[PDB]
Design a protein around this nucleic acid. Structure first.
Lengths: 621, 676
RNA sequence: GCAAAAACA
RNA sequence: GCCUGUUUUUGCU
RNA sequence: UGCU
RNA sequence: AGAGAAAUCAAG
C-alpha cells in the first residue's frame, strides 16, 4: 500500500488517526516524518530498564488522559500546545525528538523540555550524542539512513527537506489576475458557495407508453435507384481465354475483338471506347502505361474543374445565399430482388480456393471440417465469383495507385478456373491521378463484361457489343472516379464471408452441443417470414442468401446504410423481445422509427431491408 | 430484413451480427466544418428554455434553472443547483470506500503524477504554432515556454506544471524564443484566449452515424489541468458499483452479469442512450459536484481550486470555427465567415472572437467522460430509485425489480427526471424498456441468455498490418486468438479468418502466383519453407499462439542449416546503424558494446518513401537517452534518481566503470584522459 | 516507456 | 487531416 | 504485367 | 461529365 518499506506496519497504522494529514502540506510526507520521529522514540527506549521499570516513557501518539495521568504521578506538567516526545527516568528531564536540516547553529526550542536533534544523515547534535548511548545512536543512524535511501530512491528529497524545515508552499495557488480571468464566464467564484439549501424537488413528469405494435418504416417515393456501385455485381460475366499469362490473354482478346456500340449514354460518351482499345493494345505489347490521347480528357475528366469554374463565373448572377444542399429521394428498384435471386445461382467451379490450415489436434480437424462444409455450401455460387472479381479488380487498381502519374494505366480483371483457362471479366483504366489524400477521387474507366443490359438499372453505362470467337458479349464501359480508401477497403472484400459463416457455425455448433455430439452434416429447417408468412427453409440456402445480402450490403455501404443499420438494432431487439411475450415500454416522446427513417433516402439496399422489415408481422400474440 | 430474423433454431439476438455493413467503406467528411461547429455551439442555447429563445440565453454565464424551467418533453440544458448539491451529498454518504480511495489518491498518487503523462496524447492544438502537433512536441514546447517566461526549471510532477501554468497567467507579457531565430509575443489576453481555445476538426472513418460530427482538441495549457480531475474521477469510478466506464472487455461483461438478477414479480430492463450529450452539461455542475466531494472529504482549499480550474476554463471556451460557411450566388461556391452575411447562425455573431466562437454552456467535447459519468451517477442516488444502474458516458442500462408495473413506471420516470436535474436528457427514441428483463444492450453488447458474440466487430482488424512478415503474422494470429477467446469467433469462424488472413498476407508479400519474388525464388532454387515465402501453413487453430519459426523447427519443416541463416544476429538485412550494449551475466566485464542486428532476416524495415528544429531536439534527446541507458543499466528497471546534472552523473559513472574494468592503471589513465 | 492496429462510448 | 476515455493485440527500446 |  | 452527399475531388 502507501506504507514505506522501512516504516513498521504497527507504526503506520497507529499514525493514521494522529493528525489530519489531508489538510497539511505534503500530508503523506508529513505522516512519514512523524513515523520517523515515533520510530526514533521507540529506538531510544530499546528495552531499557530502571528500578524494575522502563527507563523512558514515550508520550508521543498517546491519549492525553494517560499522558496527564502519568505526568501527574511524575510531578511534571506540560502545556497542550507542545508536549515532549518522551521522558527519561535517569537525569530526570523531558526530551523531544527533532529532525533538522542543519545540525550546526542550533539552539534549544523550549525551556521546559530538552531537544534530541537529529539530521537527515542520522547524525546527532553534541548534547543529544552525549545523553544517549552508542547503541541508540547506531540504531537511530541506521533507521534514518534507510529512510534517506527510501527518500532518494523515490525522488522525494525536496518534499522531505521542506517538511523538515517547517514551512512550505501550499503546493498550488491561484493568483489575482488569473482569478479575474477565470471568473469572467461564470456566476460563481473559484470555490463556489451557493446559498441555496440542498434539496431534490419533485417535478411533474410524463407517462411511459407501450409499444403495442412494431414501427412501420417509411418507403420513399421517386425514380428507382440506378445501380450505383464500382462493378456490375450479379450481371458480371467473363470470356474463357486460352491458358497463359495476362499479356497473352489480352493479346488474344484484342486481336479477335469486334466492338460495336449498341447503347450510348450521355454520362459516358461512346467515343471513349478508343481509350479502352488503346489500353488493350498497349497491354498486349507489354507496356501497361500509355500516353494520353484526345479522348482521354473526356474519359477521365481531365481539367474539367477549370471549365466548370469558368462556366460558373460566366453564369454567376443574383445574390449570395446559403448552400442548402439536397439529396434526391429514390424508391426501391425492381432489380434488387433480381440481384438477390441471380446472385444465388449455382456455378460449376468453387470460386473459393483458400489454402487449408494445418491439422494437429482433433479440435483442428473439427474446425477445418466446418470451414470446408461452409466453403462447399457457399462456394459454388454466383456471389462467390462476383466477390472474387471484386477482390481482383480492387487489388489490381489499388496496387498501381500511390504515385503521381500523368499517363494512363490499364488494370485487367482476369481469373483462372481449375483448368488453366483465363477468365476475362473486364479491365479497369486508371488515368492521371495526382492523389495526395485518402479521400480524393482517382478517375477510372470501368470496362467489363455484362450479362444482361437494362436501361433503368444502368443509365450511365454505354453498352457495347463484343464479338469474339463466334460468341456475343456485352461491355459496360462506365466513367467513374473512386477514392483510395474505398479501393483499399474493397481490396479486402473477402472478409464478407465471415458473417454467414458465423450464422452457419453457430447453428451447427448449437445443434452439436444440445445433443452432446458433433454431426457436421446437419441441414435443419429455418422458420422465416418469406412472403409475410412463416415457412420452413433449409440452413444451406439461408446461409447462401445471407452471404448474397451481406455482399450487396458491403458494396453499397454509405452514411445512409451506416445509420440505418445502427438504428435498426434497437428495433431488432424490440422485435425479438416481442416474439417472447415481452412487453416493450417507451418514454413520452419516443419514436424509434424516426432515427431509421432519416437514413432512408436513396440507397436501394436500405430500401430493400426496409421493405423486408415492413412485410413481416409487426404485432405478436 | 426478414432474412435476418430466424424463428426456429437461433434468435435474432445471435443474428445481430448481420446488422453490420463493415468490410464496406467507412464514410468520410469532405468540406467545411463550420456548419457543424456552429450547430454544436447553438444547440445548448436552444435547450436552456422550454421555448427556444437563443437571444435570451447568450447572456447567461452559469446555467442554473429552476425545477419548473426544466424541460421534460425535450432536451434541457442546465442544472438545478440544489439538486446537484443534495445528490452529490447523497453520493458521498454512500460509497464511502470510493471516497477513501479518492483521499488515498489525493494524498499519495497525486503528488507522484508526472507531467510526462501528457505526452501520451494524440494530435494537440499548439498555442505557439496555431496548428495541431503531436503531444510530445506541444508538451516540450510548452515546457520551454514556461521555463523561459518564469526564469526557472519546471519540476517533473504535474502539480509543478500546473503551478507554472497558473504563474504564467499572472504575467503581463510573455515571449517564446525557439530555433527555426523567430520570436512571438503574447499578452495576458492573447495567451488567455489561446489557453481557452479548442481546435475543431472533422472526425473521419466513423461508422454508425448518418451525419458527420466534429471533434475538437484543447491546448497543452489545459490538458494538464484536465489530467488531475480525470485521474481522480477514474479513481472514484473504479470503486462504485454503478459505473461502467473504467472497466472494459470481459470485466465489464462480468460487472453487467453481476447485476442481471431478476427475482421479483415485475423485473424490467431499460437500455438507452442520452441525447445531446456533451452539450447539455454545464461545467459548473461538475464544479459543484467536485467541490461537494472535496468539502465532505475535508480537503483544503488549494486542491479545490486546482480541481475547479479546468471546468472554468471550459466555461470560457473558444471553439475554433472552420474555414467559413458555404455561400452560393448561382452555381458558384464561396466560403464566408459567420458575420459577413446573414445565415441561420446570426444570433451567435456576438460570440465571435477572431476565428473562434465562445460558448458558456455545454462541454462541446468529450474531455470529461469520467466526470460526466460521475455527474450521471450522483443523480441516481436517491430513495425512489432502487434498481441497478450502469452508466459509462452517455450509454446506460438499468435493471428494475419492482412488485407492480406502476411502481416500475414511476421508478423509470423518476430516473428520467433525476437525470434531467443535472442536465442529462434520455434520448426518447433510443431508450427502450422491456418489462420482463432478460433482453438488453449496453455498449453494443446484446445479451439474451448470455452476451452473444458479435462478429464483424473484429473484421476491420483482419487486414495485415504492414510492418514485416513476422510481426504481421504474429499480431494477426493473436488478434484472431483473442477474438476466439472472448467468444466473438468460434472454431469455424476462427479457422476461416485464419485462412482469409493467411491468403491476404501471402498476397501482400508477393507469395502467390507468378511475381518477381516468386520468379527469383524459382530461378535460383530457393524453397520457401516459410508462410510469407509461399510455403504451406504451419499454424493451425490450436497453434495460433505458437511462433512460426519455433513451430517449424519443432516439426522438422525448417532444418537447422537454414535456421543458422534466418536467425543470424549479423545479417545485413536487419543490421542496426549503431552499436548496442549487451549484458553479461556473471562476467568480469558485465557490459559489452558491439554491433547488432535483429535476429530474423524477415523483420526488415520498409522505407516510407517521404517544427523542424523541435525534431532535431527530439533527436538530441534520443541520443542523450541512449547514452544514459548504456551507462546506467539500472534506470532500465527503476526510475532515474542519480543526483546532479546529466553531464556530471555520466562522467562519474563512466569513471567508476573504468576503475572496475580490471585493466592496467596507466591504461585507465589514458582512457580517462580523453573524457570530456 | 514508445510505436502501430482494432473495438466501444 | 487523423480529439478524449476504457479495453485489447503485436513489435521495438 | 498472375490471390480464385 | 462523373464520384458523391448536407460539400469536397475531378491540378498547380
Amino acid at each position: 500500500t502507501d506504507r514505506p518499506d522501512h516504516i513498521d506496519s504497527r507504526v503506520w497504522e497507529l499514525s493514521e488517526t494522529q493528525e489530519d494529514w489531508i489538510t497539511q502540506v505534503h500530508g503523506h510526507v508529513r505522516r512519514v516524518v512523524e513515523c520517523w520521529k515515533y520510530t526514533i522514540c521507540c529506538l531510544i527506549s530499546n528495552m531499557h530498564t530502571h528500578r524494575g521499570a522502563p527507563q523512558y516513557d514515550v508520550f508521543k501518539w498517546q491519549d492525553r488522559s494517560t499522558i496527564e495521568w502519568i505526568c501527574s504521578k511524575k510531578k511534571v506538567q506540560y502545556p497542550e500546545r507542545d508536549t515532549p516526545d518522551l521522558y527519561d527516568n535517569e537525569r530526570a528531564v523531558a526530551y523531544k525528538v527533532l529532525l533538522v536540516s542543519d545540525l550546526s547553529d542550533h539552539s534549544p526550542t523550549s525551556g521546559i523540555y530538552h531537544d534530541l536533534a537529529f539530521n537527515l544523515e542520522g547524525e546527532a547534535e553534541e548534547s543529544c550524542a552525549l545523553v544517549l548511548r552508542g547503541s541508540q545512536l547506531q540504531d537511530i543512524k541506521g533507521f534514518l539512513c534507510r529512510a534517506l535511501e527510501w527518500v532518494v530512491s523515490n525522488n522525494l528529497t525536496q518534499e522531505v527537506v521542506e517538511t523538515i524545515s517547517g514551512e512550505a508552499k501550499l503546493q498550488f495557488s491561484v493568483g489575482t489576475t488569473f482569478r479575474t480571468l477565470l471568473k469572467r464566464d461564470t456566476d460563481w467564484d473559484v470555490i463556489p458557495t451557493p446559498r441555496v439549501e440542498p434539496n431534490v424537488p419533485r417535478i411533474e413528469g410524463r407517462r411511459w407508453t407501450q409499444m403495442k405494435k412494431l414501427p412501420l418504416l417509411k418507403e420513399k417515393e421517386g425514380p428507382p435507384s440506378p445501380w450505383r456501385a464500382l462493378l456490375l455485381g450479379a450481371d458480371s460475366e467473363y470470356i474463357v481465354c486460352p491458358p497463359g499469362t495476362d499479356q497473352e490473354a489480352i493479346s488474344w482478346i484484342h486481336s479477335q475483338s469486334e466492338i460495336e456500340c449498341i447503347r450510348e449514354s450521355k454520362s459516358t460518351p461512346a467515343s471513349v471506347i478508343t481509350c479502352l482499345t488503346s489500353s488493350l493494345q498497349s497491354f498486349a505489347e507489354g507496356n501497361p502505361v500509355r500516353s494520353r490521347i484526345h479522348e482521354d480528357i473526356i474519359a477521365f475528366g481531365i481539367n474539367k474543374k477549370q471549365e466548370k469554374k469558368q462556366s460558373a463565373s460566366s453564369s454567376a448572377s443574383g445574390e449570395w445565399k446559403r448552400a442548402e444542399y439536397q439529396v434526391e429521394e429514390m424508391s426501391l428498384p425492381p432489380w434488387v430482388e433480381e440481384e438477390m435471386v441471380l446472385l444465388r445461382s449455382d456455378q460449376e467451379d468453387n470460386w473459393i480456393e483458400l489454402e487449408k490450415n494445418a491439422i494437429y489436434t482433433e479440435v483442428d480437424g473439427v474446425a477445418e471440417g466446418l470451414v470446408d462444409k461452409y466453403i462447399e455450401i457457399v462456394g459454388r455460387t454466383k456471389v462467390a465469383s462476383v466477390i472474387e472479381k471484386w477482390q481482383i479488380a480492387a487489388t489490381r487498381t489499388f496496387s498501381q495507385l500511390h504515385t503521381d502519374r500523368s499517363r494512363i494505366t490499364a488494370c485487367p480483371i482476369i481469373t483462372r478456373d481449375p483448368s488453366g483457362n483465363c477468365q476475362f471479366w473486364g479491365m479497369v483504366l486508371l488515368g492521371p491521378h495526382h492523389v495526395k489524400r485518402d479521400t480524393d477521387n482517382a478517375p477510372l474507366l470501368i470496362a467489363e463484361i455484362m450479362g444482361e443490359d437494362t436501361e433503368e438499372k444502368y443509365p450511365k453505362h454505354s453498352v457495347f457489343s463484343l464479338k469474339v470467337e463466334e460468341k456475343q458479349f456485352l461491355l459496360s464501359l462506365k466513367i467513374t472516379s473512386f477514392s483510395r480508401n474505398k479501393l483499399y477497403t474493397f481490396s479486402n472484400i473477402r472478409r464478407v464471408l465471415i458473417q454467414p459463416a458465423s450464422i452457419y457455425s453457430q447453428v451447427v455448433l448449437s445443434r452439436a452441443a444440445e445433443n452432446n455430439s458433433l454431426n457436421l452434416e446437419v441441414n435443419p429447417e429455418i422458420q422465416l417470414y418469406l412472403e409475410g408468412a412463416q415457412r420452413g427453409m433449409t440452413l444451406y440456402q439461408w446461409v447462401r442468401m445471407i452471404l448474397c445480402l451481406e455482399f450487396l450490403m458491403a458494396i453499397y455501404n454509405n452514411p445512409q446504410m451506416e445509420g440505418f443499420l445502427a438504428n435498426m438494432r434497437r428495433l431488432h431487439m424490440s422485435r425479438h423481445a416481442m416474439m417472447e411475450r415481452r412487453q416493450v415500454f417507451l418514454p413520452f416522446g419516443s419514436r424509434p422509427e424516426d432515427k431509421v427513417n432519416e437514413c432512408i433516402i436513396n440507397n436501394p439496399i436500405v430500401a430493400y431491408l426496409a421493405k423486408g422489415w415492413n412485410s413481416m408481422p409487426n404485432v405478436y400474440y | 430484413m426478414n432474412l435476418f430474423t430466424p424463428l426456429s433454431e437461433i434468435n435474432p439476438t445471435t443474428t445481430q451480427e448481420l446488422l453490420y455493413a463493415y468490410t464496406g467503406p467507412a464514410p468520410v467528411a469532405y468540406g467545411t466544418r463550420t456548419r457543424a461547429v456552429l450547430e454544436n455551439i447553438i444547440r445548448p442555447y436552444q435547450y436552456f428554455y422550454k421555448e427556444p429563445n437563443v437571444q435570451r440565453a447568450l447572456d447567461i454565464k452559469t446555467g442554473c434553472k429552476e425545477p419548473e424551467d426544466i424541460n421534460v418533453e425535450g432536451p434541457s440544458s442546465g442544472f438545478h443547483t440544489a439538486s446537484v448539491l443534495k445528490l452529490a451529498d447523497n453520493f458521498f454518504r454512500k460509497y464511502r470506500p470510493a471516497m477513501e480511495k479518492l483521499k488515498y489518491w489525493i494524498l499519495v498518487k497525486l503528488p507522484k503524477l508526472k507531467y510526462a503523462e501528457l505526452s501520451k496524447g494524440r494530435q494537440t492544438y499548439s498555442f505557439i504554432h496555431k496548428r495541431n502537433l503531436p503531444a510530445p512536441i506541444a508538451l516540450e514546447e510548452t515546457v520551454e515556454f514556461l521555463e523561459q517566461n518564469l526564469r526557472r526549471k519546471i519540476g517533473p510532477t504535474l502539480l509543478s506544471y500546473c503551478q507554472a501554468i497558473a504563474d504564467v497567467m499572472e504575467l503581463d507579457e510573455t515571449t517564446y524564443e525557439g530555433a527555426r531565430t523567430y520570436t512571438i509575443k503574447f499578452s495576458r489576453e492573447e495567451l488567455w484566449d489561446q489557453m481557452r481555445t479548442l481546435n475543431t476538426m472533422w472526425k473521419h472513418l466513423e461508422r454508425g452515424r448518418l451525419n458527420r460530427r466534429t471533434i475538437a482538441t484543447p491546448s497543452m495549457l489545459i490538458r494538464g489541468f484536465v489530467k488531475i480531475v480525470e485521474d481522480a474521477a477514474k479513481e472514484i469510478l473504479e470503486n462504485v458499483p454503478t459505473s461502467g466506464v473504467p472497466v472494459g472487455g470481459e470485466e465489464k461483461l462480468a460487472k453487467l452479469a453481476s447485476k442481471q438478477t431478476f427475482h421479483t414479480a415485475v423485473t424490467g430492463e431499460l437500455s438507452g442512450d442520452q441525447e445531446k450529450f456533451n452539450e447539455c452539461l454545464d461545467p459548473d455542475a461538475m464544479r459543484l459536484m467536485w467541490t461537494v466531494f472535496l468539502r465532505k472529504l475535508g480537503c483544503p482549499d488549494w486542491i479545490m481550486e486546482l480541481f475547479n480550474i479546468p471546468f472554468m476554463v471550459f466555461k470560457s471556451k473558444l471553439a475554433d470555427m472552420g474555414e467559413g460557411l458555404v455561400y452560393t450566388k448561382g452555381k458558384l461556391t464561396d466560403r464566408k465567415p459567420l458575420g459577413e452575411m446573414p445565415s441561420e447562425f446570426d444570433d451567435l455573431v456576438r460570440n465571435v472572437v477572431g476565428n473562434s466562437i465562445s460558448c458558456r454552456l455545454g462541454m462541446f467535447m468529450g474531455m470529461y467522460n469520467l466526470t460526466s459519468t460521475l455527474l450521471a451517477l450522483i443523480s441516481i442516488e436517491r430513495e425512489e430509485l432502487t434498481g441497478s444502474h450502469v452508466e459509462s458516458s452517455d450509454d446506460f442500462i438499468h435493471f428494475f425489480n419492482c412488485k407492480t408495473h406502476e411502481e416500475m413506471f414511476k421508478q423509470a420516470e423518476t430516473l428520467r427526471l433525476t437525470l434531467k436535474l443535472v442536465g442529462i436528457n434520455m434520448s426518447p427514441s433510443k431508450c427502450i424498456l422491456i418489462s420482463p428483463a432478460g433482453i438488453g444492450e449496453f455498449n453494443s453488447k446484446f445479451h439474451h441468455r448470455d452476451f452473444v458474440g458479435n462478429v464483424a466487430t473484429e473484421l476491420p482488424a483482419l487486414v495485415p498490418n504492414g510492418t514485416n512478415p513476422m510481426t504481421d503474422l504474429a499480431m494477426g494470429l493473436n488478434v484472431i486468438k483473442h477474438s476466439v477467446n472472448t467468444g466473438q469467433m468460434n472454431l469455424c469462424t476462427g479457422a476461416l479468418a485464419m485462412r482469409i488472413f493467411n491468403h491476404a498476407y501471402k498476397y501482400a508479400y508477393m507469395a502467390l502466383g507468378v511475381t518477381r519474388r516468386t520468379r527469383f525464388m524459382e530461378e535460383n532454387a530457393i524453397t520457401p519453407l516459410l508462410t510469407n515465402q509461399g510455403a504451406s501453413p504451419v499454424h493451425s487453430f490450436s497453434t495460433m499462439h505458437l511462433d512460426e519459426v519455433a513451430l517449424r523447427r519443432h516439426l522438422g519443416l525448417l532444418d537447422e542449416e537454414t535456421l543458422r541463416r534466418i536467425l543470424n544476429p549479423n545479417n545485413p538485412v536487419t543490421q542496426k546503424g549503431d552499436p548496442s550494449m549487451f549484458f553479461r551475466i556473471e562476467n568480469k566485464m558485465p557490459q559489452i558494446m558491439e554491433d547488432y542486428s535483429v535476429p530474423s532476416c524477415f523483420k526488415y524495415t520498409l522505407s516510407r518513401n517521404r517544427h523542424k528544429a523541435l525534431l532535431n531536439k527530439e533527436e538530441r534527446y534520443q541520443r542523450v537517452t541512449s547514452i544514459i541507458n548504456k551507462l546506467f543499466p539500472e534506470v532500465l528497471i527503476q526510475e532515474a534518481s542519480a543526483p546532479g546534472t546529466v553531464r556530471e552523473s555520466l562522467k562519474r559513472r563512466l569513471e567508476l566503470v573504468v576503475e572496475r574494468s580490471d585493466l592496467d592503471e596507466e591504461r585507465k589513465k589514458r582512457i580517462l584522459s580523453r573524457i570530456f
